[PDB]
Design a protein around this ligand. Structure first.
Ligand SMILES: [Cl-]
Ligand code: NI
Ligand code: NI
Length: 131
């Protein structure tokens, strides 16, 4: 249960998101969760009225097993009233990480784990601990 290293997750952008709101397209933010972890999920900022949001927002997670653990990204639409509705999601195993390399991925958004839902572009940088 002791952390092997730290993975730096950059949420870069989404491209081609579906229209969801009656006007303005969507107000997207991303939730990021790491499997086999009790840390509450992280989220990006809300981008208002943008189907091609650009975030470049960075998050850090403690890694306890690079072989087993997977990240889950979920794109939600913000509204002031009501619960955010999920627009799409996908998963990304940490066994695709590379130590000390920025590695970029394009995840197609899907309904669950069909209509096209856009792409999410992210980066991972794995910094393992030494000695
Ligand atoms: Cl926000
Ligand atoms: Ni970094
Ligand atoms: Ni660098």
């Amino acid at each position: 249960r002791r952390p092997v290293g730290i993975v730096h997750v950059k949420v870069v952008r989404a491209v081609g998101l579906r229209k969801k709101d009656l006007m303005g397209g969507a107000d997207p933010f991303v939730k990021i969760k790491l499997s086999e972890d009790k840390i509450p999920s992280k989220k990006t900022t809300v981008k208002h009225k943008n189907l091609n949001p650009e975030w470049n927002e960075e998050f850090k997670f403690s890694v306890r097993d690079p072989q087993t653990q997977v990240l889950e990204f979920s794109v939600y639409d913000w509204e002031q009233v009501g619960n955010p509705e999920k627009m799409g999601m996908n998963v990304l195993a940490l066994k695709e990480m590379v130590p000390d390399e920025h590695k970029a991925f394009t995840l197609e958004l899907r309904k669950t784990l069909d209509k096209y839902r856009g792409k999410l572009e992210v980066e991972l940088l794995y910094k393992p601990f030494t000695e």
